[PDB]
Amino acid sequence: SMQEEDTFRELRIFLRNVTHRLAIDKRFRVFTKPVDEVPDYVTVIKQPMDLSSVISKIDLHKYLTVKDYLRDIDLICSNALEYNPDRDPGDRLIRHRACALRDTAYAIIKEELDEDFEQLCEEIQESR
Question: Could you tell me where the DSSP H helices lie in 1-128?
């Protein structure tokens, strides 16, 4: 219905704003674009994810719930932890930023998304 289309549009507006706030944070610059510089990334990481790809998926109407969105934020983080497992400072820096990206996204949603709004999104989606 029109009421349901309005609900998903509000979700997209919310998700674009959260993603923009993550993307302009200097700590998260490494997560803003997809990974020639890294020859072994394409074979190690089966499902690359980054914040520019997340924005594209919002605009393609691929997220109908905040859980769908957070699954892709979690994938950005989990990819980073798996590709950077060593004790070297370069690896530890990216792991710290990846965990901060995940923690920041969850904290923004916890503080700013009404749980009744997320519940409405789920109930529309489970009906489809």
Answer: 2-23, 41-44, 51-59, 66-83, 89-112, 115-127
